[PDB]
Design a protein around this ligand. Structure first.
Ligand SMILES: O=c1c(O)c(-c2cc(O)c(O)c(O)c2)oc2cc(O)cc(O)c12
Length: 844
């Protein structure tokens, strides 16, 4: 262990945000065991990735050009502007030419082929054997009807990515006692210990102890013998110890360790306090010992060795045809299991079929593995993310069952992996062991692609920072990725963390000045610009990669424009210059650092929104949403992308009117027209509004976050509406379709209109579009509530989304159901908003 070896670890831990070597909080060696087992897969991806292609991380898609983009193109032709210093030429190529057939054709028109096409002002290269039309930037430019400016520069040297040198007896447990240093005020409490043998979130068995008075020390020394036999215990089963006073304390212990051994010996586990969700499933113990409740137990080297009639048929398919949230009956399960090989021929049955398994029985499980052995039908089925996601949630704990889900994920191309990365990263919380297929799949895909890796870094880091329940597991996975991404990325991450940390302190040190009375003092803005000065001196990184948009390189601070927002939680409105000189503009980079809101929620919501945009893509729809970047940098803090030329709808009302609820109906249209002097840009901004508005209307409704204050919705000087603050979230409305909105669509009273009719038809089209992916949205929504909501979610919560999508209904009934929702908004006018103004603004 040279000084060099130690040094490396130190910085790694620094980047990680946690010390992955720490052992102060572990009752075994699973963590260390995983750090070692990931070394092979890590290296196995590193050496197998093309140095060049991994250096320029091309971003492409093998999906067909949507219909709304087909139009943007005229006769299989595209024009690209190539620049060389102040010399730039425009060329017209075929939408099927490769970036090489472009450079070659560029040397013809105007050592030798030692150059490459990069996007002006961005680290995004158009390279590889792929049609130019299959590059995201290209398709992005088309949609925005913008020009494609590329710069001819030198290809990065792959050397910069260099990687450093490398029993029939019934099971029984003994509860000795619980110890807690201090206790609650209401002190005439009573408590007992509930021991459960869980698996897949369902209890196979349960035992309890005699209730006793709640004291700083409670002994029992009672033997608890369950009914299930030691031989029946399935690998992945959990011994969930809980304390009731109402549940208050809980801790879990894997009965079968990572080595297939039966857990034994004396244990003193430090439990978690309850304030259902992902956290109640963790194997991790509470690190804080001096304050947490502790359970002392005892355990008894046993090793776990590695046709049908028409109405019956028609009743089987009826169950299989059921949605995800519909439970199963005793008969339901018995029917699914009896006909395993028949329910096996249909992939959409797997979830249902594998929950009908009696895992608490060695025999049944063994048969299951046999059943699974023959997976031709599955292996050859078409990838279905929604179906695959269902096998990765809290309902399954069998290593083999989950493994086949991951198996199908292997088919996803980088572009799609990017859409579901966040969700899949959260799914790790559902794994019973630190080392898993899903865990290795992510590690692998991160080392195989810089964009996937960049986000995998922050995604994991957000959880490492504010989740003591899973920071140990994630930290091991992050390290594994940091030990194989390269020295270049290892450097960017450093610059980014540095910039972040420094700005974090400031953001918080500024908020400390007035937290109950909005009033951005003149002196505060004076001190703010001062603290940044001290940093920009030479201590702050000259530049850094923007965490939510890695293709962008931020430079120096434009202290002049920086300020503290006139917001309650007083966030920071920072602006940077683009560190890239080849950029074709002078616009700054607006970044918002905020403390107070749980950005993990926004981050998750924003992601579903991106999932909905692509979903509409499959149907050739463009709702003009604006899922601005947002990354939870750490505990209660993170950044927010600033959308240029945009304001709050409320602000729009306040200017005309003021700090009153006497909302007008033309103010908005008067604000947009004023902004769009160029006529051709009004009707354009108007159609935009109709779509963006409709877009958010549909999406927001389905997610059950439509009733919202006028201050959390924004509009751009280009007519783009987009909801913002997704923080936590009598009269009520399905979504926001206020009079000022319907007005811009040329509709004063309850009278229809051309644009309003356009609006409606779009809403329906988008609404029906999502319904085709009901199952996908149902599972994502559920995982989100389980891993993204501080409180404990329930079935009721999940089922909402189901109703919103009107599952079971026909397209017609559906189409209508949404048109009625649109009506409520018309019959509610400014009612709701006025209430929000009265509630939020007045405190009533
Ligand atoms: O407090 C917030 C805020 O002010 C803005 C904002 C975004 C823009 O794009 C602007 O142009 C602007 O003026 C403000 O976004 C947010 C987005 C969130 O997810 C959460 C937030 O709390 C805010």
């Amino acid at each position: 262990a040279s000084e060099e070896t130690l040094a490396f670890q130190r910085q790694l831990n620094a980047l990680i945000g946690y010390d992955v070597t720490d052992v102060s909080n572990v009752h075994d060696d699973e963590l260390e065991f995983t750090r070692r087992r990931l070394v092979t897969p890590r290296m196995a991806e590193v050496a197998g990735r093309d140095p060049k292609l991994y250096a320029m991380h091309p971003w492409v898609t093998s999906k067909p050009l949507p219909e709304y983009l087909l139009k943007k193109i005229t006769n299989n032709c595209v024009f690209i502007v190539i620049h060389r210093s102040t010399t730039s030429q425009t060329i017209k190529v075929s939408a099927d030419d490769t970036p090489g057939t472009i450079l070659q054709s560029f040397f013809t028109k105007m050592n030798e082929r030692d150059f490459v096409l990069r996007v002006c002002g961005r680290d995004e290269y158009l390279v590889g054997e792929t049609p130019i039309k299959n590059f995201q930037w290209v398709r992005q430019c088309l949609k925005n009807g913008e020009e494609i400016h590329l710069v001819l520069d030198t290809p990065p040297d792959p050397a910069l990515d260099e990687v450093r040198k490398e029993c029939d007896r019934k099971f029984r447990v003994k509860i000795r006692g619980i110890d807690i240093p201090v206790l609650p005020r209401t002190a005439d409490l009573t408590v007992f210990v509930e021991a459960n043998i869980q698996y897949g979130q369902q209890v196979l068995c349960q035992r309890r102890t005699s209730p006793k008075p709640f004291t700083e020390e409670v002994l029992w020394n009672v033997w608890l013998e369950f009914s299930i036999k030691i031989k029946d215990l399935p690998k992945g089963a959990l011994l969930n110890l809980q304390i009731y006073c109402q549940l208050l304390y809980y801790v879990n212990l894997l009965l079968i360790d990572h080595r297939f051994l039966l857990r034994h010996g004396e244990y003193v586990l430090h439990m978690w306090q309850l304030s259902f969700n992902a956290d109640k499933l963790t194997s991790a113990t509470n690190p804080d010992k001096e304050n947490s409740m502790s359970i002392s137990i005892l355990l008894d080297h046993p090793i776990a060795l590695p046709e049908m009639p028409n109405q019956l048929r028609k009743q089987l398919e009826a169950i299989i045809a059921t949605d995800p949230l519909n439970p199963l009956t005793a008969e339901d399960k018995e029917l699914l299991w009896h006909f395993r090989y028949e329910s096996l021929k249909d992939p959409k049955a797997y979830p249902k079929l594998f929950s009908s398994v009696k895992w608490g029985q060695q025999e049944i499980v063994a048969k299951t593995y046999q059943l699974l052995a023959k997976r031709e039908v599955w292996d050859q089925s078409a990838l279905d993310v929604g179906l695959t996601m269902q096998l990765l949630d809290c309902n399954f704990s069998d290593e083999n069952v989950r493994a086949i889900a991951v198996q199908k994920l292997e088919s996803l191309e980088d572009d799609d992996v990017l859409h579901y990365l966040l969700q899949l990263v959260q799914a790790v919380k559902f794994e019973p062991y630190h080392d898993s297929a899903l865990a290795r799949f992510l590690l692998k895909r991160g080392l195989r692609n810089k964009r996937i890796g960049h986000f995998l870094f922050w995604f994991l880091r957000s959880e490492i920072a504010q989740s003591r329940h899973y920071q140990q597991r994630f930290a091991v996975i992050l390290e594994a990725y940091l030990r194989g991404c390269g020295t270049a990325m290892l450097h960017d991450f450093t610059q980014q963390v540095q910039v972040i940390d420094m700005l974090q302190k400031v953001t918080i040190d500024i908020k400390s000045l007035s937290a109950e009375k909005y009033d951005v003092s003149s002196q505060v803005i004076s001190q703010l610009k001062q603290k940044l000065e001290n940093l920009q001196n030479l201590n702050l990184p000259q530049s850094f990669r923007v965490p939510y948009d890695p293709g962008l390189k931020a430079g120096a601070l434009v202290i002049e424009k920086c300020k503290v927002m006139a917001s309650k939680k007083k966030p920071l409105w920072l602006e940077f210059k683009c560190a890239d000189p080849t950029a074709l503009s002078n616009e700054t980079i607006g970044i918002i650092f905020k403390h107070g809101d749980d950005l993990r929620q926004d981050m998750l919501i924003l992601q579903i929104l991106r999932i909905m945009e692509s979903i509409w893509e499959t149907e050739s729809l463009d709702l003009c949403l604006l899922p601005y970047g947002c990354i939870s940098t750490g505990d209660k803090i993170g950044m927010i992308e600033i959308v240029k030329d945009a304001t709050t709808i409320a602000k729009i009302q306040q200017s005309t009117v003021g700090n009153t609820g006497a909302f007008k109906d033309e103010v908005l249209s008067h604000w947009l027209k004023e902004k769009c002097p160029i006529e051709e840009k009004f009707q354009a901004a108007v159609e935009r509004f109709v779509y963006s508005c409709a877009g958010y209307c549909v999406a927001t409704f389905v997610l059950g976050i439509g009733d919202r204050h006028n201050d959390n919705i924004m509009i751009s000087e280009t007519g783009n509406l987009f909801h913002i603050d997704f923080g936590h979230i009598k009269e009520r409305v399905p979504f926001v379709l206020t009079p000022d909105f319907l007005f811009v669509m040329g509709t004063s009273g309850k009278k229809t209109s051309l644009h309003f009719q356009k609006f409606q038809d779009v809403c329906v089209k988008a609404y029906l579009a999502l319904r085709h992916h009901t199952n996908l949205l149902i599972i994502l929504f559920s995982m989100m509530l389980m891993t993204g909501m501080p409180q404990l979610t329930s079935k009721e919560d999940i089922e909402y989304i189901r109703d919103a999508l009107t599952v079971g209904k026909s397209e017609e009934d559906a189409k209508k159901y949404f048109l009625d929702q649109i009506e409520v908004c018309r019959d509610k006018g400014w009612t709701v908003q006025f209430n929000w103004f009265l509630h939020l603004v007045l405190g009533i």
